[PDB]
Paper text:
Replication Protein A (RPA) is a heterotrimeric single stranded DNA-binding protein with essential roles in DNA replication, recombination and repair. In Archaea, the same function is also fulfilled by a heterotrimeric RPA. We report three crystal structures and five cryo-EM structures of Pyrococcus abyssi RPA (hereafter referred to PabRPA), in its apo form as well as bound to ssDNA. We find that archaeal and eukaryotic RPAs share a conserved heterotrimerization core, which is composed of three OB domains connected through a three-helix bundle formed by a C-terminal α-helix from each subunit.
As the use of homopolymeric ssDNA substrates is more convenient for structural studies, we verified that PabRPA binds to a poly-dT ssDNA, with a similar affinity to random ssDNA (1.25 ± 0.6 nM vs 0.71 ± 0.01 nM). Our data show that binding to ssDNA occurs primarily through the Tri-C. Indeed, while a complete PabRPA complex is required for the optimal binding to ssDNA, the Tri-C binds ssDNA with a dissociation constant in the nanomolar range (Kd=18.8 ± 6.0 nM). To gain insights into the structural basis for the high-affinity interaction between PabRPA and ssDNA, we determined the 3.2 Å crystal structure of the Tri-C bound to poly-dT20 ssDNA. The modeled ssDNA lies in a channel that extends from the Rpa1 to the Rpa2 subunits showing 14 contiguous nucleotides that traverse the OB-2 and OB-3 DNA-binding grooves. Rpa3 does not make any contact with the ssDNA in the structure of PabRPA. While both Rpa1 and Rpa2 subunits individually are capable of binding ssDNA, no interaction was observed for the Rpa3 subunit. Indeed, although the chemical nature of the interactions and the overall ssDNA binding path through RPA are conserved, the DNA-binding grooves of the respective OB domains are substantially different in Archaea and Eukarya. In the PabRPA structure, basic residues of the β3-β4 helical insertion in the OB-2 make contact with the DNA phosphodiester backbone and delineate a crevice that is narrower than in the eukaryotic RPA. The helical insertion also exists in eukaryotes but adopts a different conformation and is devoid of conserved basic residues, suggesting that it may be an evolutionary relic derived from an archaeal ancestor. On the other hand, the contacts between the OB-2 Zn-finger domain and ssDNA are remarkably conserved between Archaea and Eukarya. Indeed, in the vicinity of their Zn-finger domains, the interacting residues and the two neighboring bases superimpose perfectly.
Numbering used by the authors:
A (entry chain B): 3 to 180
B (entry chain C): 5 to 117
C (entry chain A): 186 to 358
The structure:
DNA sequence: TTTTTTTTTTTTTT
């Protein structure tokens, strides 16, 4: 299975809690301050600096600013090609895996392409809609967790209220991290 | 660690003293090709944008991301990024700016652990 | 009819999905019959192209584009053919055929050359937001594949209006 | 209406 790429503000990624999976094949993920488990990120911003391509072409990187935060986007080996596509000033949409290096979250480029200014507007509208949807669902799930915890009874109650069972596990994991 | 400060979205009339990097969106009304400067009008005011290399055309709708320069001659913006916002729906952008201003502080304050 | 990827089922018909191009599996061209668009065989004994349904035909180059699409709620494989694929790729099928030939001459099979050309030359298409319309078929191992009949650029005002409707349902407006 | 058939995973950076 290929889990979805979550459309988020760069601030939400930066303020999140990166989770490094111990297994060599388990995907790494991030848990936001609003208890959102994120495997892949989908952001829309402006390339603020001319890309950095290593002389030896081992890595290529570029910076994206969306107004809420600034994040680095990285492509390694042949993937350096992604960084060559962009230029300083381009308004782009980026999809990729969330990574953490030197305790700073970043995006491992899976795809980057130039977008129309109305796509940036659509991105902001969608990001806010998804955020409100998630917060309201997580608020109800938090009340269930505080009253019953992770039990067979709480899982039935969560399904009845349109809450995924996975959401209760995310809350428990976030409580353990904090 | 001086990390890049994200460009703060503002209107020309709402620029604050504490702002160091801003994002402005407007229409070009005058271009000085010798001093590499241009006049941007967003509807709320006119800002003098100093450009290093890219000069837009007169009447073009552009988005500028720049650093604010405060001198004895006034406040001018040293442009870092100039994007073509000619086909951009500024009505939709204005509507989303108001939605974010109203809803974002409420969403953050809903966290009761 | 607009449906989120999380709601898509096998056998779904006339589904409209708006999402981001996430992966490019294979880019290749094959000789096809101009009438039925099926793969034609070259007969070395007669020197002619034979279609199983129409016999001796003049072949046309058909482009195949296999990629993935993500809408924030799910992921789905997508396949585009001919003119729709050529329009998205921005490269002529004759030019793609020449590049596939160069890769095959280097010791790669047709399957290997198609995957290589998608990663090396058509990686630029990834990250692009598009609207795909088609029917969903279920592959016995590849999973759900959306056979896209057409693709088009996103109408941002239409999409923003859909989001405003969802915000009204949440009590924002 | 079509060709051909094996999904997705990590880790690497002056
Ligand atoms: Ca890759
Ligand atoms: Ca400039
Ligand atoms: Ca069905
Ligand atoms: Ca076609
Ligand atoms: Ca068509
Ligand atoms: Zn035929």
């Amino acid at each position: 299975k290929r889990m979805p790429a979550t459309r988020l503000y760069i601030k939400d990624i930066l303020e999140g809690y990166f989770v490094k999976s111990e297994g060599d094949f388990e995907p790494n993920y991030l848990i936001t301050k609003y208890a959102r488990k994120v495997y892949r990120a989908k952001i829309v911003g402006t390339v603020v600096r001319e890309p950095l391509i290593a002389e030896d072409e081992t890595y290529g990187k570029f910076q994206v600013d969306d107004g809420t935060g600034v994040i680095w986007v990285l492509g390694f080996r042949d993937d350096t090609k992604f960084a060559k596509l962009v230029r300083k000033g381009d308004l782009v949409q980026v999809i990729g895996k969330i990574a953490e290096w030197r305790d700073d979250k970043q995006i491992l480029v899976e795809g980057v392409s130039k977008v129309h200014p109305n796509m940036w507007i659509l991105h902001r509208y969608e990001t806010l809609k998804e955020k409100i949807e998630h917060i309201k669902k997580a608020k109800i799930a938090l009340e269930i967790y505080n009253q019953y915890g992770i039990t067979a009874k709480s899982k039935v109650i969560a399904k009845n209220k349109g809450i995924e069972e996975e959401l209760l596990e995310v809350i428990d994991e976030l409580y353990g991290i904090m | 660690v001086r990390r890049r400060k994200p460009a703060v979205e503002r209107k020309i009339s709402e620029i604050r003293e504490e702002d160091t990097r801003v994002s402005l969106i407007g229409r070009v009304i005058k271009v000085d090709k010798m001093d590499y400067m241009f006049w941007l009008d967003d509807g709320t005011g006119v800002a003098i944008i100093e450009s290093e290399s890219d000069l837009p055309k007169v009447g073009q709708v552009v988005r500028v991301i720049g650093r604010i320069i405060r001198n004895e001659e006034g406040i001018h913006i040293y442009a870092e990024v100039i994007q073509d916002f000619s086909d951009a729906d500024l009505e939709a952008l204005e509507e989303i700016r108001e939605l974010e201003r109203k809803l974002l502080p409420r969403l953050e304050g809903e966290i009761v652990w | 009819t607009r449906k989120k990827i999380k709601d898509i089922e096998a056998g779904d018909r006339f589904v409209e999905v708006r999402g981001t191009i996430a992966k490019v599996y294979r880019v290749l061209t094959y000789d096809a019959c101009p009438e039925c668009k099926k793969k034609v065989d070259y007969d070395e004994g007669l020197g002619v192209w034979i279609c199983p349904e129409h016999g001796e035909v003049q072949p046309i180059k058909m482009t195949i584009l296999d990629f993935g699409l993500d809408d924030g709620t799910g992921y789905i494989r997508v396949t585009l053919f001919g003119d729709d694929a050529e329009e998205l790729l921005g490269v002529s099928p004759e030019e793609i055929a020449e590049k596939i030939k160069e890769l095959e001459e280097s010791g790669l099979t047709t399957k290997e050359a198609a995957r290589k050309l998608a990663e090396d030359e058509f990686y630029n298409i990834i990250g692009r937001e598009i609207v795909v319309r088609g029917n969903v078929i279920e592959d016995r191992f590849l999973g759900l594949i959306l056979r896209a009949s057409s693709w088009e650029d996103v109408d941002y005002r239409r999409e923003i209006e859909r989001i405003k409707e969802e915000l009204e349902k949440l009590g924002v407006m």
